[PDB]
Each structure stands twice: as structure tokens, then as C-alpha cells.
Amino acid sequence: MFLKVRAEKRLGNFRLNVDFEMGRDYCVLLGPTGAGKSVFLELIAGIVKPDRGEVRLNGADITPLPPERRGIGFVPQDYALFPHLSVYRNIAYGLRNVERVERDRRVREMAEKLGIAHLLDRKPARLSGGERQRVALARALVIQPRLLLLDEPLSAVDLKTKGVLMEELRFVQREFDVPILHVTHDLIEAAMLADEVAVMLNGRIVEKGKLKELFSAKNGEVAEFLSARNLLLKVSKILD
């Protein structure tokens, strides 16, 4: 288990107590809005110290470490692209610890590996939804991330587009062998990308495993949530 996370966190009337093991592949935790997914990630991220417990990454305890000294690549809902910086400078941020020409190399290397090397001069606004997503990823990867956190990186996107994008994620993961912890409330995404699937409900990660397993083994909570398969099935019937 590449990433292990056992920790409790109190925030208002909200309690986050998780027990989460994770592979070195594409994990995806499903959970309604307000299940604690985003804080969970900020926890791994190290942008929130837990009240109790720890965050192990590679067997090593990471909790005492700062988000800056952890190797994790973070990406928040509706990406945090530095609006005052060009695509290039955006990607470059995070490499200030690398030699200049080497940095430029790595940057363009990645700008090309993602088909954006032409947008190198534009700034976030001039970018299309898709262009952002790329720049976002670009900047997250050039750091050679130990892990890769994402959340709702596909929300606010038409089904049509989603699919193409998901395939790109699969690829990016197989291509950079970068484990990914993807957070959503959409089955379609879990079903299309996950090698493993967790399911959060009220700050607690009820169960993890593989979708198929998660259905059959109906425990009336995760069972209820994953019951959306019917609607997906009814829809497939009504169409083509």
C-alpha cells in the first residue's frame, strides 16, 4: 500500500475519521457533495494537519511534513491556475529548485507532452476549459509527483467531452506511471477510470475495493449510493 491514511479531523459539526489504503495506480473515491472528499485531499496534501492520526506515504510517516516538502501534486476543483502568470510561468512555478535551462527543458518537454507548447505565452483566461485542464496537469507533473491528487477535475463538463478527457487521464497515468487519487461524486468516472474505488460518506470512507465487488456486497449505505447504476442502465436502454 503506497499511501496509507488513518486519521481523524474535526471541523464544526463535521468529523473526518478515515482508514484508507491505496495502491500505486488510479484510485477514485466516490462520495456525495459534502462527504469530506476535499478536506481528505487537503489532509493527504498536508494543507491541513489532522487532529489525530497520521498520513503514511511509501511506508514513511509524512504527517509532520509540510505540503512543500511532500512530493504530492495537488489540484483543487476548478484548477488553481495562477491568473497573473503565463502558461509557461505557471508550469515553471514549482521548479525554482532546478537549473534554468534544465527547467525550460522540462517545461517545454511537458508543454509538448500535453500539446500546449503553443499556448506557452497566453494567460489562463485565453484558455479553453480543456486548455486549462492541460496546463493544470502540465504544472502538476513537471514536479515528478510522488502522487497526484485531483477533485471534480471533470465537473462542469459535458458528457461528450468527459469521455475523451477520461481516456486522456488513463493515458496520462499509464504514460507517467503516476498514481492518482481522483475525487468525484460521479459513478461514470469511477467506472471509467478506477483500478480501485473508495466510497466516502460523512467524512468516513465506508468501503474500498472494485466497483463490481462494491455492488454485490450491498450494505445498504454504499449499496444505496451505487444504486445509481439503474439510472445509467435505464438510460442506456432508452438510447441507441
Partner: peptide, 15 residues
């Protein structure tokens, strides 16, 4: 300023 921006900035290893 969106706090995340700052979060990310530390994420990208920035004091």
C-alpha cells in the same frame, strides 16, 4: 486572493 492559489504555491514547494 483565492486561498488555494497559496495552497498550491506551497504545494509546488514554496515557503
Amino acid at each position: 486572493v483565492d486561498v488555494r492559489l497559496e495552497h498550491v504555491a506551497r504545494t509546488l514547494g514554496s515557503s
